[PDB]
Design an enzyme around this catalytic site. Structure first.
Site, PDB file in Angstrom:
ATOM      1  N   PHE A  34       0.783  -1.214   0.000  1.00 23.70           N
ATOM      2  CA  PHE A  34       0.000   0.000   0.000  1.00 23.70           C
ATOM      3  C   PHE A  34       0.822   1.275   0.000  1.00 23.70           C
ATOM      4  CE2 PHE A  34      -4.111  -1.834  -0.151  1.00 23.70           C
ATOM      5  CZ  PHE A  34      -4.106  -2.987   0.636  1.00 23.70           C
ATOM      6  N   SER A 131      12.233   0.124 -17.781  1.00 20.10           N
ATOM      7  CA  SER A 131      11.766   1.359 -18.368  1.00 20.10           C
ATOM      8  C   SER A 131      12.739   1.881 -19.392  1.00 20.10           C
ATOM      9  CB  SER A 131      11.730   2.329 -17.174  1.00 20.10           C
ATOM     10  OG  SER A 131      11.756   3.683 -17.585  1.00 20.10           O
ATOM     11  N   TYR A 156      16.633   6.740  -9.400  1.00 16.69           N
ATOM     12  CA  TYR A 156      15.556   5.865  -9.870  1.00 16.69           C
ATOM     13  C   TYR A 156      15.966   5.050 -11.094  1.00 16.69           C
ATOM     14  CZ  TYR A 156      11.398   4.204 -12.390  1.00 16.69           C
ATOM     15  OH  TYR A 156      10.482   3.453 -13.094  1.00 16.69           O
ATOM     16  N   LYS A 160      16.895   0.821 -11.858  1.00 16.80           N
ATOM     17  CA  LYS A 160      16.294  -0.047 -12.872  1.00 16.80           C
ATOM     18  C   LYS A 160      17.396  -0.687 -13.717  1.00 16.80           C
ATOM     19  CE  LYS A 160      11.749   0.046 -12.172  1.00 16.80           C
ATOM     20  NZ  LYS A 160      11.009  -1.165 -11.757  1.00 16.80           N
ATOM     21  N   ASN A 205       3.472  13.743 -11.363  1.00 16.92           N
ATOM     22  CA  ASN A 205       4.724  14.115 -11.992  1.00 16.92           C
ATOM     23  C   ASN A 205       4.711  13.895 -13.508  1.00 16.92           C
ATOM     24  OD1 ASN A 205       6.186  14.801  -9.538  1.00 16.92           O
ATOM     25  ND2 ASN A 205       5.837  12.600  -9.063  1.00 16.92           N
ATOM     26  N   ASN A 206       3.799  13.017 -13.961  1.00 17.50           N
ATOM     27  CA  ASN A 206       3.689  12.732 -15.363  1.00 17.50           C
ATOM     28  C   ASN A 206       2.728  13.689 -16.039  1.00 17.50           C
ATOM     29  OD1 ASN A 206       4.079   9.548 -14.236  1.00 17.50           O
ATOM     30  ND2 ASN A 206       5.319  10.205 -15.984  1.00 17.50           N
ATOM     31  N   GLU A 300      14.866  19.693 -15.320  1.00 18.11           N
ATOM     32  CA  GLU A 300      16.189  19.116 -15.208  1.00 18.11           C
ATOM     33  C   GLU A 300      16.116  17.619 -15.591  1.00 18.11           C
ATOM     34  OE1 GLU A 300      18.481  19.861 -11.212  1.00 18.11           O
ATOM     35  OE2 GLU A 300      18.750  17.705 -11.779  1.00 18.11           O
TER      36      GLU A 300
HETATM   37  N1  LIG Z   1       4.222   4.396 -14.584  1.00 21.57           N
HETATM   38  C1  LIG Z   1       5.256   4.628 -15.404  1.00 21.57           C
HETATM   39  O1  LIG Z   1       5.220   5.588 -16.170  1.00 21.57           O
HETATM   40  C2  LIG Z   1       6.474   3.660 -15.426  1.00 21.57           C
HETATM   41  C3  LIG Z   1       7.403   3.765 -16.529  1.00 21.57           C
HETATM   42  C4  LIG Z   1       8.358   2.742 -16.530  1.00 21.57           C
HETATM   43  C5  LIG Z   1       8.561   1.750 -15.614  1.00 21.57           C
HETATM   44  N2  LIG Z   1       7.628   1.761 -14.577  1.00 21.57           N
HETATM   45  C6  LIG Z   1       7.720   0.765 -13.485  1.00 21.57           C
HETATM   46  O2  LIG Z   1       6.580  -0.057 -13.501  1.00 21.57           O
HETATM   47  C7  LIG Z   1       6.239  -0.489 -12.177  1.00 21.57           C
HETATM   48  C8  LIG Z   1       4.763  -0.185 -11.998  1.00 21.57           C
HETATM   49  O3  LIG Z   1       4.656   1.250 -12.117  1.00 21.57           O
HETATM   50  P1  LIG Z   1       3.258   1.969 -11.714  1.00 21.57           P
HETATM   51  O4  LIG Z   1       3.080   3.143 -12.564  1.00 21.57           O
HETATM   52  O5  LIG Z   1       2.191   0.937 -11.685  1.00 21.57           O
HETATM   53  O6  LIG Z   1       3.512   2.441 -10.181  1.00 21.57           O
HETATM   54  P2  LIG Z   1       2.683   2.229  -8.888  1.00 21.57           P
HETATM   55  O7  LIG Z   1       3.302   3.004  -7.799  1.00 21.57           O
HETATM   56  O8  LIG Z   1       1.247   2.576  -9.138  1.00 21.57           O
HETATM   57  O9  LIG Z   1       2.678   0.704  -8.536  1.00 21.57           O
HETATM   58  C9  LIG Z   1       3.738   0.110  -7.759  1.00 21.57           C
HETATM   59  C10 LIG Z   1       3.101  -0.671  -6.663  1.00 21.57           C
HETATM   60  O10 LIG Z   1       4.164  -1.180  -5.806  1.00 21.57           O
HETATM   61  C11 LIG Z   1       3.754  -1.120  -4.483  1.00 21.57           C
HETATM   62  N3  LIG Z   1       4.959  -1.123  -3.665  1.00 21.57           N
HETATM   63  C12 LIG Z   1       5.926  -0.144  -3.531  1.00 21.57           C
HETATM   64  N4  LIG Z   1       6.926  -0.509  -2.715  1.00 21.57           N
HETATM   65  C13 LIG Z   1       6.581  -1.793  -2.325  1.00 21.57           C
HETATM   66  C14 LIG Z   1       7.229  -2.728  -1.482  1.00 21.57           C
HETATM   67  N5  LIG Z   1       8.380  -2.506  -0.828  1.00 21.57           N
HETATM   68  N6  LIG Z   1       6.607  -3.907  -1.307  1.00 21.57           N
HETATM   69  C15 LIG Z   1       5.398  -4.165  -1.939  1.00 21.57           C
HETATM   70  N7  LIG Z   1       4.718  -3.373  -2.710  1.00 21.57           N
HETATM   71  C16 LIG Z   1       5.363  -2.187  -2.876  1.00 21.57           C
HETATM   72  C17 LIG Z   1       3.017   0.213  -4.437  1.00 21.57           C
HETATM   73  O11 LIG Z   1       2.237   0.323  -3.231  1.00 21.57           O
HETATM   74  C18 LIG Z   1       2.219   0.219  -5.761  1.00 21.57           C
HETATM   75  O12 LIG Z   1       0.909  -0.337  -5.670  1.00 21.57           O
HETATM   76  C19 LIG Z   1       7.261   0.183 -11.220  1.00 21.57           C
HETATM   77  O13 LIG Z   1       8.349  -0.703 -10.863  1.00 21.57           O
HETATM   78  C20 LIG Z   1       7.752   1.353 -12.082  1.00 21.57           C
HETATM   79  O14 LIG Z   1       9.070   1.725 -11.630  1.00 21.57           O
HETATM   80  C21 LIG Z   1       6.559   2.618 -14.519  1.00 21.57           C
HETATM   81  C1  LIG Z   2      12.582  13.207 -15.211  1.00 21.22           C
HETATM   82  C2  LIG Z   2      11.426  12.239 -15.240  1.00 21.22           C
HETATM   83  O1  LIG Z   2      10.399  12.511 -14.652  1.00 21.22           O
HETATM   84  N1  LIG Z   2      11.534  11.099 -15.936  1.00 21.22           N
HETATM   85  C3  LIG Z   2      10.388  10.165 -15.886  1.00 21.22           C
HETATM   86  C4  LIG Z   2       9.316  10.558 -16.896  1.00 21.22           C
HETATM   87  O2  LIG Z   2       9.917  10.763 -18.148  1.00 21.22           O
HETATM   88  P1  LIG Z   2       9.082  11.483 -19.314  1.00 21.22           P
HETATM   89  O3  LIG Z   2       9.621  12.864 -19.584  1.00 21.22           O
HETATM   90  O4  LIG Z   2       9.136  10.705 -20.585  1.00 21.22           O
HETATM   91  O5  LIG Z   2       7.540  11.542 -18.985  1.00 21.22           O
HETATM   92  P2  LIG Z   2       6.628  12.747 -18.349  1.00 21.22           P
HETATM   93  O6  LIG Z   2       5.260  12.212 -18.237  1.00 21.22           O
HETATM   94  O7  LIG Z   2       7.149  13.156 -17.018  1.00 21.22           O
HETATM   95  O8  LIG Z   2       6.749  13.899 -19.405  1.00 21.22           O
HETATM   96  C5  LIG Z   2       6.385  13.735 -20.769  1.00 21.22           C
HETATM   97  C6  LIG Z   2       6.668  15.058 -21.450  1.00 21.22           C
HETATM   98  O9  LIG Z   2       5.792  16.061 -20.873  1.00 21.22           O
HETATM   99  C7  LIG Z   2       6.535  17.149 -20.362  1.00 21.22           C
HETATM  100  N2  LIG Z   2       5.801  17.638 -19.179  1.00 21.22           N
HETATM  101  C8  LIG Z   2       5.528  16.766 -18.148  1.00 21.22           C
HETATM  102  C9  LIG Z   2       4.813  17.117 -17.116  1.00 21.22           C
HETATM  103  C10 LIG Z   2       4.315  18.456 -17.007  1.00 21.22           C
HETATM  104  O10 LIG Z   2       3.650  18.903 -16.092  1.00 21.22           O
HETATM  105  N3  LIG Z   2       4.657  19.303 -18.072  1.00 21.22           N
HETATM  106  C11 LIG Z   2       5.371  18.960 -19.179  1.00 21.22           C
HETATM  107  O11 LIG Z   2       5.606  19.747 -20.098  1.00 21.22           O
HETATM  108  C12 LIG Z   2       7.910  16.611 -20.096  1.00 21.22           C
HETATM  109  O12 LIG Z   2       8.872  17.647 -20.254  1.00 21.22           O
HETATM  110  C13 LIG Z   2       8.065  15.642 -21.295  1.00 21.22           C
HETATM  111  O13 LIG Z   2       8.502  16.285 -22.498  1.00 21.22           O
HETATM  112  O14 LIG Z   2       8.336   9.519 -17.031  1.00 21.22           O
HETATM  113  C14 LIG Z   2       8.815   8.199 -17.365  1.00 21.22           C
HETATM  114  C15 LIG Z   2       7.537   7.385 -17.309  1.00 21.22           C
HETATM  115  O15 LIG Z   2       7.019   7.540 -15.983  1.00 21.22           O
HETATM  116  C16 LIG Z   2       9.806   7.735 -16.297  1.00 21.22           C
HETATM  117  O16 LIG Z   2      10.277   6.406 -16.571  1.00 21.22           O
HETATM  118  C17 LIG Z   2      10.933   8.766 -16.179  1.00 21.22           C
HETATM  119  O17 LIG Z   2      11.774   8.351 -15.104  1.00 21.22           O
END
Ligand SMILES: NC(=O)c1ccc[n+]([C@@H]2O[C@H](COP(=O)([O-])OP(=O)(O)OC[C@H]3O[C@@H](n4cnc5c(N)ncnc54)[C@H](O)[C@@H]3O)[C@@H](O)[C@H]2O)c1
Ligand SMILES: CC(=O)N[C@H]1[C@@H](OP(=O)(O)OP(=O)(O)OC[C@H]2O[C@@H](n3ccc(=O)[nH]c3=O)[C@H](O)[C@@H]2O)O[C@H](CO)[C@@H](O)[C@@H]1O
Ligand SMILES: NC(=O)c1ccc[n+]([C@@H]2O[C@H](COP(=O)([O-])OP(=O)(O)OC[C@H]3O[C@@H](n4cnc5c(N)ncnc54)[C@H](O)[C@@H]3O)[C@@H](O)[C@H]2O)c1
Ligand SMILES: CC(=O)N[C@H]1[C@@H](OP(=O)(O)OP(=O)(O)OC[C@H]2O[C@@H](n3ccc(=O)[nH]c3=O)[C@H](O)[C@@H]2O)O[C@H](CO)[C@@H](O)[C@@H]1O
Ligand SMILES: [Cl-]
Ligand SMILES: [Cl-]
Ligand SMILES: [Cl-]
Ligand SMILES: [Mg+2]
Lengths: 345, 345
Positions: A34, A131, A156, A160, A205-206, A300
């Site tokens: 959680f 990733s 981070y 990975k 953050n995304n 950054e």
């Molecule tokens: N979402 C993205 O954009 C993105 C991009 C690339 C790679 N990933 C990777 O994919 C995976 C899934 O990402 P997501 O977006 O679903 O994130 P998420 O945070 O929604 O899901 C991760 C889950 O892991 C659980 N968790 C965290 N630490 C834990 C621990 N110590 N023990 C057990 N459970 C734990 C969290 O509670 C959560 O439900 C992650 O490893 C992430 O790094 C995600």
């Molecule tokens: C520095 C960082 O965060 N890197 C993460 C981010 O990269 P990544 O940049 O690809 O993904 P984001 O969702 O954070 O951003 C996508 C694009 O949108 C722009 N943008 C984003 C948010 C916002 O409020 N305004 C804006 O302009 C970013 O500059 C980028 O050009 O997402 C990937 C998927 O989760 C992760 O694996 C990366 O670790």
């Protein structure tokens, strides 16, 4: 039948994957602590309670931490697993830079512990959440699997990359292991029902969730992180891939394990990149709402463009991303609208 | 705040460094779990019992595993350390190849746990046991600190690199940290008394103890891992450095921390490489014995040649290895001869 362990399965990508596993006939067992998933008060995380509802299939669940060796030991003794899909981990870039040890502990030590138990129990079949970040700043585009990895900028991304390396070594050392490392690009969207999706806490953050939050009227405008990049419109370009497609790629990976594939690595992306502005335009379209934005300084570590070469996955996994931009936006909007504050009742 | 914690202090490099510490006026606290050490006749491992004799000073010691959080916690509550010298870990290139998880667990997880405890108790000065293996396959020689690190050829080297990386991240996140990373070259030789030295268990993995064992007649012959390398004689080239010089390097590192140096990295080598064959020759000369060797295949994980550029350490640590090849062999021989079966049976 044997089960499929899904770590971090209550999360964004994991919950969608659990749904797909159930639809595909598999029997999942989820573990989650959680850390980044909503509870609700019942026996399941809300995400999984809803997945059960949507599929009409049960989700077995155990609240626990992958850092808990003893709990992992008991888990492997309780259930008979045939494979492990590993999503559990920390993923906030900004946070990683600030608290590197937390990331190394959860991500590295947690994964190491899980690999040791799998080895110990004879479950040498893994699907890993990697990733495109492991490729570092793109040296060329599109990014194929042979593009160099490592030299990551934040803890981070480093974690990975190190994980990937550890798994490669494990497979090299014991040929009986099968592991599929999936390098996700930019997961977006939500299940078509609108009942589950990404549930970020606080400011997302995304890009996508920020955009949808602006649309729903929770945020005033979108801050665009730079418009001077070397791209058609100057804003960053990424490979957005539907979480549903992503989830389906996990099922394709399990099938790959069954072929005794050894160590395999695949990009999970669409191969099409869209700019920040294009994503905003599409979300305006899906939402029917205005999405104001403001150009601010570059973030950054950001790069101009990042997109996949998804040929290998198509070739070997027989997988291709099916859902386009409109579907991603429509599905995201639906989830956003139907659940303005994410999970709860 | 007076003491210095020495992890893996009962080992080869550790015992010698404990001795230098004592003589330099420091107050070490040593911890070891005996994985690669010999439990003495008393509480103290034999090595440290001898160290006490040689120095006329007492060694505080506590049997524990860096993997045991509980034990670490107590320890840190029990003593006020001014710094930590971290030698504990798994150290063989080739063995790492077959046993990656053990290396990852002991090295990575062990180190992370250590760092967390340190941070948590405000013990932010560290001396870390790094390795020339972090440079991977040399792109040029001699190796300076700026030579690329990573792209390791074996899990052991990967583990060391990853640790370096984590440390660099930690120091970034917290400017108050002082950490000196010492990239040791190939440690060899023994304390001048012949009372202590390297005490390998079973078949020695490394060159010198194996060479010496042939000489004392404990091994029938030496197995030479490949003769087709791009070296003068086609055998492996390495920078052998006396354990005593390495130990002294550690006192210099402790001094460096007093300058609030932050993150520093130094090679600890002589700058002179020697071939496998040259090493045998030197030992034949030192022992006056017959040293028979069989050429075999190249060993997985080994690079062709590597030696240090010790300028930086010279300039910044004000440290240079004094001890030459003959001295190393004579010292190794003396220890082997006086202790044919090591620290006991
Ligand atoms: N979402 C993205 O954009 C993105 C991009 C690339 C790679 N990933 C990777 O994919 C995976 C899934 O990402 P997501 O977006 O679903 O994130 P998420 O945070 O929604 O899901 C991760 C889950 O892991 C659980 N968790 C965290 N630490 C834990 C621990 N110590 N023990 C057990 N459970 C734990 C969290 O509670 C959560 O439900 C992650 O490893 C992430 O790094 C995600
Ligand atoms: C520095 C960082 O965060 N890197 C993460 C981010 O990269 P990544 O940049 O690809 O993904 P984001 O969702 O954070 O951003 C996508 C694009 O949108 C722009 N943008 C984003 C948010 C916002 O409020 N305004 C804006 O302009 C970013 O500059 C980028 O050009 O997402 C990937 C998927 O989760 C992760 O694996 C990366 O670790
Ligand atoms: N040995 C070399 O040739 C070389 C050169 C570069 C780096 N290093 C590093 O220097 C350090 C010491 O090397 P060494 O030659 O003296 O090896 P060693 O095996 O003699 O010393 C390591 C010591 O750590 C102890 N130890 C191992 N795992 C432990 C654990 N989990 N908890 C507590 N103690 C534990 C062992 O019992 C041993 O006494 C290691 O980190 C090694 O990788 C050495
Ligand atoms: C066990 C050990 O202390 N390894 C250390 C050694 O690595 P390294 O692997 O270089 O040391 P070894 O003693 O195992 O190898 C040195 C050379 O001797 C050869 N050889 C070795 C043994 C044998 O029976 N036959 C043979 O021919 C090897 O192929 C190689 O060319 O120095 C590194 C620093 O540079 C350290 O970080 C390692 O901790
Ligand atoms: Cl079961
Ligand atoms: Cl931290
Ligand atoms: Cl292993
Ligand atoms: Mg170029």
């Amino acid at each position: 039948a044997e089960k499929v362990l899904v770590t971090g399965g209550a999360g964004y990508i994991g919950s969608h994957t659990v749904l797909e596993l159930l639809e595909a006939g598999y029997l999942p067992v989820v573990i989650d602590n959680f850390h980044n998933a909503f509870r609700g008060g019942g026996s399941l995380p809300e995400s999984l309670r809803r997945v059960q509802e949507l599929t009409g299939r049960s989700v077995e669940f155990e609240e626990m931490d992958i850092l808990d060796q003893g709990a992992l030991q008991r888990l492997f003794k309780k259930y008979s697993f045939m494979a492990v899909i590993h999503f559990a981990g920390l993923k906030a870039v900004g946070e990683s830079v600030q608290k590197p040890l937390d990331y190394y502990r959860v991500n590295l030590t947690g994964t190491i512990q899980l690999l040791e138990i799998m080895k110990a129990h004879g479950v040498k079949n893994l699907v890993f959440s990697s990733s495109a970040t492991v490729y570092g700043n793109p040296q060329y585009l599109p990014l194929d699997e042979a593009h160099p990895t490592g030299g990551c900028t934040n803890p981070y991304g480093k974690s990975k990359f190190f994980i990937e390396e550890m798994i490669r070594d494990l497979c090299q050392a014991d040929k009986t292991w099968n592991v599929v490392l999936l390098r996700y690009f930019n997961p977006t969207g939500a299940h078509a029902s609108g009942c589950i999706g990404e549930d970020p806490q606080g400011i997302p953050n995304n890009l996508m969730p920020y955009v949808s939050q602006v649309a729903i009227g929770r945020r005033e405008a979108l801050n665009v992180f730079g418009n001077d990049y070397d791209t058609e419109d100057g804003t960053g370009v990424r490979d957005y891939i539907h979480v549903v497609d992503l989830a389906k790629g996990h099922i394709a990976a399990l099938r790959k394990l069954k072929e005794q594939c050894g160590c395999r690595i695949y990009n999970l992306g669409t191969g099409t990149g869209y700019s920040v502005l294009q994503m905003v335009q599409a979300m305006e379209k899906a939402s029917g709402k205005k999405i104001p934005y403001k150009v601010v300084a570059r973030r950054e570590g950001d790069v101009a463009a990042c997109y996949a070469n998804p040929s290998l996955a198509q070739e070997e996994l027989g997988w291709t991303a099916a859902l386009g931009l409109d579907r991603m936006c429509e599905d995201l909007w639906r989830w956003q609208k139907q659940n303005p504050s994410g999970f709860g009742t």
